[PDB]
Amino acid sequence: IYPEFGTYPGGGESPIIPFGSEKNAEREVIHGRWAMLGVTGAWAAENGTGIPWFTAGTLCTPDDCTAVADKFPGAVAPLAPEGSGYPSFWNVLIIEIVLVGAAEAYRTGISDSPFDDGLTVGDVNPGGRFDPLGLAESGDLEELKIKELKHCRLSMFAWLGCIFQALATQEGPIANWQSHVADPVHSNVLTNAAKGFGFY
Amino acid sequence: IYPEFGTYPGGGESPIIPFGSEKNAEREVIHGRWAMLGVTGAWAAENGTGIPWFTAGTLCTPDDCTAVADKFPGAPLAPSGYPSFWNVLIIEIVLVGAAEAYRTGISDSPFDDGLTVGDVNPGGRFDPLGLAESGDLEELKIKELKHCRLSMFAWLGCIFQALATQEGPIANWQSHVADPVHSNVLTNAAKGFGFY
Amino acid sequence: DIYPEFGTYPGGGESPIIPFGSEKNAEREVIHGRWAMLGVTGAWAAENGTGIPWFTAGTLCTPDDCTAVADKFPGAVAPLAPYPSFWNVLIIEIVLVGAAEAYRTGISDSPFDDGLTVGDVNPGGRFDPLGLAESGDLEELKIKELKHCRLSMFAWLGCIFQALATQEGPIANWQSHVADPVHSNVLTNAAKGFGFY
Ligand SMILES: CC1=C[C@H](O)CC(C)(C)[C@H]1/C=C/C(C)=C/C=C/C(C)=C/C=C/C=C(C)/C=C/C=C(\C)CCC1=C(C)C[C@H](O)CC1(C)C
């Protein structure tokens, strides 16, 4: 259901853009799960540490990646020994791209499917293996599907936000949010347009 | 008649961007009217006041929109710092929200005048002179969409130019007329847009 | 395996991303890319011959005059200028290119009328002077040109993008990258902030 605006892929069509390829539905949902994780990560990283997500791109560089050690709120220990440099960027990126590429190739059937029970390639939400808690079978899986997709679109809008705010304010989404909640009259996009977004 | 590149929706129907729905034709002509009003409003704003159109909002302020009071040439817009930005905004939100709800039909009908909800240029009521019936309607809609498209392209130019020159549309007009060959787009790029 | 790269060619198979139903854009991709390949190729050739970036090569010429190119070419036995004037080369450029466009798209009559249909992107009847069209099979050679066409369009997009980020020039960016690839790339230039941040 979409009383707010638009509709879901199963029924109806967007007047703003024709449906086109089907696989856009699959593409949209995965994009949204990713933006959910990205926005939440931006939110929580800048909540605990304070640094914006976009600046946090340089959180690890081939010369400087041991900086990340113990950069987590309340973390029991640092990620790696402090000042060792053993948490090199080369290592952490290699491990990352290995685990991601394996997950994505198993997702899309590039390589194989290690699990032998269904798990059809090309589905948003199989739920054989990727539902350990049984909340889909518990009920309202379809309601949860609409809920999922709406959270997807909201989070992609939020991520497009966080990108835009970075491009204009250069301050970070939570810092912008705190500034807006403190004095909403004089902390908005248009007063930043009046200052000229820095570039003007 | 539309003897120009492309084709009006419902005619020959040969678009660059695929014709997804009629509703895009509706959005084009409605964007076109608002861009018509935007272009002529900017033109009159800065030939009268002398400021860039985009800074007009900057000249108004939430605390003092009396900064824009009586900016109109040849005319007391308001007597005290009475005109507030929220004041004009709440009058505004009511009027434009009514008019839009009335146009699309989310609210009830204003009147039982034979009007068709959701259709452009229905005419009759919205034509006090009756030009729609006095002239043949078809070529008149062609002119409607043609001027709509021209003003939209003008508005796209004005926004991108406010981004480029940072001086406003008359300033581009004046820079271009006083020196056509130099002080143009490619000289502005040559000397830099202020960033390079 | 002809075109195992991502996607499919316009003649056969629907795209993987953007659906389409018009053959006009299928024509247009290959001409846009051909124009790109000439642009990108000239990017190296010019930037290597003169040692300046292509985007400042545009403004090297002024409306008042265009003499900067005189003896700017590498190995020129005689400079092209002896009227090194922009408008003198402009009218001849716009007339020659305009005529070419009219002749290739059908605005004006073809000067040869050798059967080259303007609608056809491959009027080999007068084109491919070497005659490689008939020396080898045409289909594979269509694919090869197309692949390069897409390659060079993406390279032009990336070229212009790097132009806007670093303003140092595509091949100067290349030299900086190969000099120290670890600490010279898009992400370290974004760490500097592309100059604007
Ligand atoms: C966690 C975190 C912390 C670190 O510190 C830094 C870090 C970078 C690592 C970071 C990690 C980041 C990650 C993983 C991000 C993932 C992002 C993703 C996948 C975003 C998706 C973005 C999606 C967009 C734009 C879509 C736009 C589409 C739009 C508007 C149109 C929608 C639309 C449709 C089709 C039909 C309607 O009817 C009408 C309209 C036209 C409106």
XYZ file of C-alpha atoms and ligand atoms in Angstrom:
635
model
C 0.000 0.000 0.000
C 1.128 3.577 -0.705
C -1.338 6.182 0.548
C 1.649 8.533 0.906
C 2.817 8.697 -2.699
C 3.440 6.398 -5.618
C 2.988 2.651 -5.339
C 4.843 -0.670 -5.025
C 6.102 -2.793 -7.992
C 3.451 -5.488 -7.522
C 0.550 -3.187 -8.374
C 0.381 0.191 -10.047
C 2.994 2.266 -11.847
C 4.838 5.523 -11.205
C 3.691 8.445 -13.347
C 7.071 10.076 -12.650
C 8.923 7.332 -14.535
C 7.635 4.249 -16.439
C 8.506 0.881 -14.915
C 10.820 -0.107 -17.767
C 12.895 -3.176 -16.958
C 11.409 -5.396 -14.318
C 14.697 -5.960 -12.543
C 14.587 -2.332 -11.403
C 12.303 -3.630 -8.607
C 15.019 -5.998 -7.420
C 17.573 -3.253 -7.999
C 15.539 -0.724 -6.009
C 15.125 -2.959 -2.987
C 18.787 -3.915 -2.777
C 19.732 -0.253 -3.272
C 17.434 0.548 -0.372
C 18.806 -2.052 1.999
C 22.206 -0.619 1.186
C 21.100 2.962 1.814
C 19.509 1.849 5.078
C 22.809 0.397 6.194
C 24.722 3.415 4.872
C 22.497 6.051 6.482
C 22.429 4.165 9.767
C 26.203 3.816 9.639
C 26.596 7.515 8.950
C 24.160 8.246 11.778
C 25.844 6.011 14.343
C 29.452 6.810 13.379
C 28.863 10.534 13.635
C 26.784 9.937 16.791
C 29.583 8.239 18.695
C 32.762 9.522 17.120
C 31.512 12.774 15.649
C 33.255 12.596 12.282
C 31.078 12.764 9.134
C 30.713 9.610 7.064
C 32.132 11.271 3.952
C 35.219 12.528 5.758
C 35.432 9.060 7.312
C 36.280 7.768 3.856
C 39.868 8.490 4.869
C 39.375 6.468 8.060
C 41.992 4.047 6.603
C 44.612 4.785 3.953
C 47.559 2.599 2.838
C 49.929 4.713 4.895
C 47.410 5.400 7.719
C 44.836 2.720 8.570
C 45.796 1.920 12.171
C 44.057 5.219 13.026
C 40.775 3.245 13.125
C 41.903 1.296 16.169
C 39.552 1.858 19.121
C 37.325 4.199 17.100
C 34.083 2.763 18.338
C 31.937 4.116 21.210
C 32.556 2.070 24.335
C 34.665 -0.480 22.462
C 36.242 -2.981 24.837
C 39.650 -2.730 23.154
C 41.208 -1.146 20.087
C 40.640 -2.938 16.784
C 44.340 -3.709 16.512
C 47.442 -3.005 18.580
C 47.852 0.758 18.775
C 50.680 2.175 16.683
C 51.556 -1.243 15.256
C 50.370 -0.457 11.738
C 49.459 -4.132 11.353
C 45.847 -3.036 10.581
C 47.051 -1.857 7.201
C 44.590 -0.583 4.639
C 45.833 -3.205 2.188
C 44.817 -5.982 4.581
C 41.445 -4.550 5.592
C 40.405 -3.726 2.033
C 41.537 -7.139 0.783
C 39.518 -8.912 3.481
C 36.568 -6.652 2.730
C 36.498 -7.125 -1.002
C 36.934 -10.877 -0.558
C 33.967 -11.158 1.812
C 31.781 -8.776 -0.173
C 32.604 -10.312 -3.535
C 31.885 -13.768 -2.186
C 28.576 -12.585 -0.711
C 27.564 -10.808 -3.930
C 28.634 -13.611 -6.275
C 26.679 -16.060 -4.127
C 23.809 -13.572 -4.180
C 23.646 -13.165 -7.944
C 24.868 -16.609 -8.950
C 28.153 -15.501 -10.489
C 30.129 -18.229 -8.702
C 27.737 -20.667 -7.007
C 25.310 -21.066 -4.106
C 27.006 -22.753 -1.096
C 23.645 -23.554 0.500
C 21.777 -26.505 -0.998
C 18.148 -25.679 -0.005
C 16.446 -23.428 -2.542
C 17.602 -19.824 -2.134
C 16.674 -18.802 -5.629
C 19.068 -16.403 -7.350
C 17.344 -13.150 -8.239
C 15.000 -12.604 -5.271
C 14.860 -9.648 -2.879
C 14.051 -11.760 0.171
C 14.361 -15.565 -0.032
C 14.066 -16.221 3.697
C 15.100 -19.862 3.701
C 18.532 -19.072 5.106
C 18.352 -15.295 5.546
C 15.453 -15.528 7.988
C 16.999 -17.068 11.112
C 14.406 -15.564 13.480
C 11.264 -16.611 11.611
C 9.603 -13.200 11.706
C 8.305 -13.586 8.149
C 6.561 -16.847 8.953
C 5.541 -15.330 12.264
C 3.265 -13.202 10.131
C 2.770 -9.962 8.217
C 5.703 -10.838 5.966
C 3.908 -9.039 3.163
C 3.070 -6.180 5.477
C 6.727 -6.278 6.386
C 7.541 -6.237 2.685
C 5.648 -2.993 2.177
C 7.224 -1.745 5.411
C 10.627 -2.839 4.117
C 10.216 -1.123 0.764
C 8.974 2.096 2.327
C 11.944 2.108 4.702
C 14.116 1.470 1.618
C 12.859 4.492 -0.239
C 12.985 6.712 2.844
C 16.584 5.682 3.519
C 17.694 6.291 -0.059
C 16.099 9.721 0.178
C 17.952 10.185 3.473
C 21.247 9.141 1.863
C 20.697 11.483 -1.075
C 20.174 14.012 1.661
C 23.391 13.232 3.517
C 25.289 13.540 0.249
C 23.686 16.876 -0.634
C 24.201 18.320 2.831
C 27.857 17.340 2.608
C 28.138 19.073 -0.757
C 26.602 22.271 0.600
C 27.258 22.607 4.340
C 30.435 20.502 4.617
C 29.540 19.857 8.262
C 28.042 16.364 8.583
C 24.389 15.253 8.819
C 24.062 15.139 12.629
C 25.820 18.468 13.066
C 23.335 19.860 10.555
C 20.508 18.140 12.436
C 21.611 19.558 15.789
C 21.941 23.013 14.248
C 18.444 22.703 12.756
C 16.843 21.407 15.935
C 18.516 24.132 18.017
C 17.377 27.100 15.854
C 15.122 25.845 13.023
C 14.261 29.355 11.781
C 17.875 30.209 10.865
C 19.229 26.688 10.232
C 17.835 25.420 6.947
C 18.954 24.969 3.353
C 17.777 28.440 2.339
C 19.722 30.341 4.977
C 22.700 28.270 3.819
C 21.814 29.426 0.323
C 21.904 32.968 1.716
C 25.409 32.366 3.066
C 25.987 30.846 -0.350
C 26.717 27.202 0.598
C 30.330 28.374 1.110
C 30.992 28.631 -2.634
C 29.109 31.918 -3.078
C 1.620 25.046 -36.111
C 4.810 23.603 -34.640
C 7.391 23.811 -37.440
C 10.184 23.272 -34.940
C 12.386 20.445 -33.684
C 10.374 17.783 -31.917
C 6.635 17.423 -31.615
C 3.841 18.460 -29.274
C 2.261 15.547 -27.324
C -0.601 13.963 -29.232
C 0.734 15.035 -32.635
C 3.369 13.240 -34.686
C 4.682 11.701 -31.443
C 8.439 11.342 -32.081
C 10.176 12.186 -28.789
C 13.815 11.965 -27.770
C 12.868 10.849 -24.253
C 10.235 8.066 -24.504
C 6.617 9.166 -24.008
C 5.977 7.269 -20.795
C 2.510 8.658 -20.049
C 0.137 11.475 -20.900
C 0.643 12.731 -17.341
C 4.092 13.872 -18.468
C 2.374 16.026 -21.119
C 0.365 17.555 -18.308
C 3.432 18.193 -16.198
C 5.207 19.741 -19.173
C 2.489 22.279 -19.864
C 2.011 23.101 -16.154
C 5.777 23.441 -15.581
C 5.624 25.627 -18.671
C 3.081 28.042 -17.254
C 4.969 28.347 -13.994
C 8.197 28.904 -15.943
C 6.409 31.544 -18.044
C 5.431 33.375 -14.893
C 8.895 32.823 -13.421
C 10.718 34.285 -16.415
C 8.493 37.341 -16.708
C 8.497 37.755 -12.928
C 12.290 37.728 -12.793
C 12.473 40.087 -15.765
C 10.103 42.587 -14.183
C 11.646 42.147 -10.723
C 15.117 43.202 -11.784
C 14.147 45.774 -14.408
C 12.086 47.391 -11.643
C 14.063 46.817 -8.449
C 17.546 46.110 -9.822
C 18.479 42.973 -7.840
C 18.931 39.366 -9.049
C 15.728 37.314 -8.857
C 17.257 34.616 -6.648
C 18.428 37.156 -4.064
C 14.850 38.462 -3.745
C 14.200 35.715 -1.219
C 17.469 36.670 0.459
C 16.218 40.243 0.632
C 13.110 39.039 2.432
C 13.795 37.605 5.872
C 11.746 35.678 8.476
C 12.188 38.495 10.974
C 11.841 41.395 8.472
C 10.104 40.829 5.157
C 9.557 44.593 5.274
C 12.913 44.651 3.474
C 10.901 43.772 0.342
C 8.103 46.177 1.182
C 7.294 48.618 -1.619
C 9.918 47.355 -4.061
C 7.559 48.050 -6.977
C 8.333 51.024 -9.265
C 5.904 53.914 -9.555
C 3.591 52.873 -6.707
C 3.072 51.918 0.338
C 3.012 48.116 0.298
C 2.418 47.969 4.050
C 2.503 50.554 6.884
C 5.568 49.623 11.593
C 7.301 46.647 9.988
C 3.931 44.929 9.567
C 4.759 42.743 6.519
C 6.251 39.567 7.946
C 7.588 36.656 5.988
C 5.393 34.261 7.950
C 2.485 36.665 7.333
C 2.776 36.584 3.596
C 3.618 32.870 3.862
C 0.420 31.907 5.702
C -1.738 33.945 3.318
C 0.313 32.281 0.583
C 0.030 28.706 1.832
C -3.727 29.103 2.105
C -4.137 30.586 -1.379
C -1.755 28.319 -3.304
C -2.800 25.211 -1.370
C -6.434 25.951 -2.145
C -5.691 26.641 -5.820
C -3.640 23.451 -6.219
C -6.189 21.275 -4.404
C -8.841 22.878 -6.597
C -6.809 22.117 -9.708
C -6.047 18.452 -9.034
C -9.189 17.611 -7.050
C -7.929 16.379 -3.679
C -10.336 18.881 -2.074
C -14.015 19.242 -2.953
C -15.184 21.210 -5.962
C -15.215 25.019 -5.670
C -18.282 25.347 -7.845
C -20.633 23.349 -10.067
C -19.550 25.276 -13.273
C -19.093 22.272 -15.574
C -15.373 22.087 -14.886
C -13.292 18.989 -15.539
C -10.941 18.037 -12.726
C -7.459 16.946 -13.782
C -7.536 18.355 -17.344
C -5.460 21.278 -18.634
C -6.742 24.446 -20.300
C -10.402 23.539 -19.778
C -11.289 27.154 -20.484
C -14.669 28.786 -20.190
C -14.379 29.927 -16.577
C -10.651 30.702 -16.735
C -11.118 32.777 -19.920
C -12.961 36.024 -19.081
C -12.520 37.247 -22.681
C -13.451 33.927 -24.285
C -10.377 33.809 -26.519
C -10.535 30.008 -26.525
C -13.874 30.027 -28.353
C -13.313 33.168 -30.447
C -10.166 31.789 -32.075
C -9.656 28.252 -33.302
C -8.399 26.409 -30.242
C -5.895 24.032 -31.886
C -3.183 26.370 -33.145
C -3.712 28.398 -29.967
C -2.724 25.398 -27.814
C 0.215 24.955 -30.135
C 1.330 28.485 -29.312
C 0.579 27.738 -25.655
C 2.971 24.809 -25.494
C 5.540 26.496 -27.735
C 5.852 29.587 -25.542
C 5.749 27.238 -22.547
C 8.767 25.351 -23.874
C 10.607 28.567 -24.705
C 10.077 29.951 -21.205
C 11.141 26.670 -19.589
C 14.366 26.685 -21.591
C 14.763 30.333 -20.590
C 14.297 29.406 -16.960
C 16.872 26.579 -17.280
C 19.268 29.109 -18.764
C 18.584 31.626 -15.996
C 19.147 29.133 -13.186
C 22.346 27.750 -14.723
C 23.549 31.266 -15.438
C 22.854 32.513 -11.922
C 25.071 29.550 -11.070
C 27.688 30.541 -13.654
C 28.046 34.338 -13.799
C 26.567 35.021 -10.308
C 25.169 38.334 -11.557
C 21.616 37.687 -12.807
C 19.888 37.585 -16.193
C 20.004 41.271 -17.117
C 23.710 41.247 -16.343
C 24.141 38.489 -18.912
C 21.946 40.393 -21.324
C 23.985 43.576 -20.792
C 27.334 41.763 -20.938
C 26.225 40.169 -24.185
C 24.835 43.311 -25.839
C 27.537 45.814 -24.874
C 30.195 43.384 -26.157
C 28.679 40.543 -28.225
C 31.898 38.951 -29.355
C 33.716 39.037 -25.992
C 32.270 38.949 -22.419
C 30.170 35.930 -23.560
C 29.732 32.324 -22.331
C 33.083 31.150 -23.646
C 34.971 34.195 -22.436
C 33.339 33.699 -19.041
C 34.644 30.142 -19.139
C 38.006 31.454 -20.383
C 38.421 33.910 -17.509
C 36.802 31.348 -15.214
C 33.416 31.255 -13.543
C 34.998 32.403 -10.253
C 36.091 28.867 -9.284
C 38.902 28.169 -11.758
C 32.152 -15.332 -27.257
C 31.434 -12.008 -29.008
C 30.838 -9.198 -26.476
C 31.067 -11.035 -23.133
C 31.298 -7.620 -21.520
C 28.383 -6.385 -19.415
C 25.295 -5.634 -21.477
C 24.452 -6.394 -25.078
C 24.893 -4.632 -28.403
C 21.942 -2.594 -29.793
C 21.197 -4.914 -32.718
C 20.501 -7.964 -30.548
C 19.368 -8.365 -26.957
C 17.705 -5.865 -24.655
C 20.045 -3.781 -22.539
C 20.706 -4.788 -18.937
C 19.644 -1.380 -17.525
C 17.935 1.161 -19.820
C 15.137 -0.373 -21.923
C 14.501 1.234 -25.285
C 12.281 0.875 -28.328
C 13.765 3.442 -30.738
C 16.451 2.594 -33.295
C 17.342 6.301 -33.386
C 19.312 6.108 -30.147
C 20.912 2.869 -31.382
C 22.215 4.922 -34.324
C 23.154 7.775 -32.015
C 25.348 5.797 -29.638
C 27.705 4.800 -32.408
C 27.973 8.264 -33.875
C 28.435 9.853 -30.404
C 31.161 7.395 -29.698
C 32.923 7.922 -33.010
C 33.002 11.627 -32.262
C 34.287 10.760 -28.817
C 37.119 8.582 -30.214
C 38.253 11.463 -32.335
C 37.983 13.781 -29.302
C 39.802 11.534 -26.798
C 42.453 10.587 -29.354
C 43.085 14.238 -30.076
C 43.218 14.722 -26.312
C 46.410 12.704 -26.071
C 47.804 13.787 -29.391
C 47.322 17.495 -28.725
C 48.192 17.423 -25.024
C 51.345 15.405 -25.821
C 52.305 17.522 -28.828
C 51.823 20.929 -27.194
C 52.104 20.117 -23.489
C 48.866 21.920 -22.532
C 45.468 20.577 -21.454
C 42.654 20.356 -23.984
C 40.231 22.524 -22.008
C 42.725 25.401 -21.978
C 43.457 24.495 -25.609
C 39.902 25.610 -26.257
C 40.558 29.110 -24.904
C 44.023 29.221 -26.454
C 42.158 30.641 -29.427
C 40.430 34.002 -29.058
C 37.696 35.585 -31.183
C 40.056 38.377 -32.077
C 42.803 36.037 -33.286
C 44.021 32.435 -33.355
C 47.826 32.376 -33.802
C 48.720 30.271 -30.768
C 48.484 27.061 -32.808
C 51.078 28.433 -35.246
C 54.108 26.135 -34.896
C 52.380 24.539 -31.892
C 52.136 21.210 -33.685
C 55.038 18.790 -33.076
C 57.405 18.285 -35.989
C 55.661 20.790 -38.259
C 57.970 21.399 -41.212
C 56.282 24.792 -41.712
C 53.835 26.494 -39.305
C 50.227 26.511 -40.464
C 50.140 30.288 -40.213
C 52.332 32.178 -42.712
C 45.845 34.681 -41.356
C 46.164 33.161 -37.912
C 42.693 34.462 -37.056
C 39.859 32.693 -35.283
C 36.976 33.848 -37.468
C 38.858 32.969 -40.635
C 39.215 29.388 -39.442
C 35.775 29.488 -37.803
C 33.664 30.191 -40.866
C 35.504 27.489 -42.779
C 35.170 25.055 -39.862
C 31.469 25.667 -39.309
C 30.768 25.494 -43.050
C 32.719 22.256 -43.526
C 31.262 20.577 -40.442
C 27.758 21.852 -41.138
C 27.944 20.502 -44.666
C 29.192 17.178 -43.345
C 26.253 16.957 -40.955
C 23.739 17.861 -43.649
C 25.300 15.328 -45.972
C 25.417 12.541 -43.378
C 21.891 13.062 -41.962
C 20.005 14.098 -45.103
C 19.346 17.803 -44.575
C 21.017 18.545 -47.940
C 21.753 16.451 -51.010
C 24.605 14.005 -50.973
C 27.547 15.266 -53.085
C 28.289 11.752 -54.317
C 24.832 10.181 -54.363
C 26.663 6.842 -54.454
C 23.789 5.167 -52.597
C 24.896 6.251 -49.131
C 21.639 6.373 -47.234
C 21.850 9.090 -44.598
C 19.953 6.859 -42.216
C 22.806 4.361 -42.425
C 25.649 4.680 -39.928
C 27.704 2.349 -42.128
C 27.650 3.664 -45.721
C 30.671 1.557 -46.576
C 29.890 1.914 -50.287
C 31.982 5.094 -50.300
C 33.522 4.779 -46.847
C 36.133 2.339 -45.457
C 38.559 3.272 -48.293
C 40.967 0.489 -47.316
C 38.042 -1.840 -47.917
C 38.403 -3.710 -44.638
C 34.591 -4.000 -44.691
C 34.819 -6.648 -47.431
C 38.325 -7.901 -46.601
C 36.979 -9.302 -43.324
C 33.551 -10.221 -42.013
C 31.541 -7.099 -41.207
C 29.712 -8.234 -38.045
C 32.710 -8.736 -35.769
C 34.200 -5.490 -37.014
C 30.963 -3.698 -36.116
C 31.370 -5.028 -32.616
C 34.999 -3.943 -32.407
C 34.186 -0.395 -33.447
C 31.247 -0.287 -31.037
C 33.324 -1.519 -28.110
C 35.878 1.202 -28.809
C 33.020 3.658 -29.266
C 31.736 2.918 -25.774
C 35.260 2.818 -24.384
C 36.078 6.231 -25.683
C 32.758 7.747 -24.645
C 33.366 6.588 -21.087
C 36.958 7.815 -21.371
C 35.718 11.227 -22.508
C 33.251 11.310 -19.628
C 36.044 10.423 -17.268
C 38.397 12.790 -19.047
C 36.051 15.731 -18.570
C 35.371 14.644 -14.989
C 39.050 14.637 -14.117
C 39.265 17.909 -15.930
C 36.802 19.343 -13.446
C 38.343 17.734 -10.392
C 42.089 18.304 -10.825
C 42.373 20.622 -13.859
C 45.852 19.175 -14.438
C 44.950 17.446 -17.702
C 44.145 13.793 -18.531
C 47.638 12.590 -19.399
C 49.225 14.677 -16.629
C 46.779 12.907 -14.319
C 47.975 9.671 -15.908
C 51.628 10.521 -15.255
C 50.848 11.487 -11.664
C 48.928 8.234 -11.176
C 51.641 5.958 -12.563
C 54.302 7.896 -10.632
C 52.773 7.087 -7.219
C 49.506 5.153 -7.680
C 49.029 4.569 -3.945
C 49.025 8.268 -2.999
C 47.736 9.705 -6.310
C 44.202 8.719 -7.371
C 40.609 9.979 -7.168
C 40.368 9.277 -3.462
C 43.520 11.128 -2.419
C 42.442 14.033 -4.630
C 39.095 13.901 -2.829
C 41.122 13.920 0.398
C 42.590 17.206 -0.813
C 39.010 17.851 -1.784
C 39.413 18.396 -5.543
C 40.623 21.942 -4.725
C 37.182 23.226 -3.632
C 37.043 21.822 -0.125
C 28.024 3.582 6.474
C 28.874 4.697 6.009
C 29.710 5.182 6.960
C 31.144 5.594 6.597
O 31.636 6.550 7.521
C 31.250 6.148 5.169
C 30.595 5.219 4.134
C 30.701 5.850 2.739
C 31.438 3.940 4.122
C 29.110 4.889 4.480
C 28.532 3.748 3.660
C 27.673 4.010 2.439
C 26.757 3.112 1.661
C 26.949 1.631 1.682
C 25.794 3.727 0.954
C 24.794 3.131 0.117
C 24.037 3.965 -0.621
C 22.959 3.667 -1.564
C 22.856 2.292 -2.147
C 22.136 4.686 -1.854
C 21.009 4.669 -2.738
C 20.616 5.826 -3.265
C 19.508 5.949 -4.161
C 19.272 7.003 -4.961
C 20.074 8.258 -5.047
C 18.087 6.979 -5.790
C 17.560 8.097 -6.302
C 16.356 8.029 -7.055
C 15.448 9.014 -7.038
C 15.614 10.284 -6.262
C 14.230 8.838 -7.803
C 13.140 8.145 -7.436
C 11.900 7.979 -8.226
C 11.432 6.816 -8.788
C 12.279 5.787 -9.563
C 9.977 6.678 -9.139
C 9.103 7.709 -8.403
O 7.746 7.581 -8.788
C 9.591 9.145 -8.612
C 11.110 9.298 -8.430
C 11.635 9.976 -9.704
C 11.322 10.263 -7.239
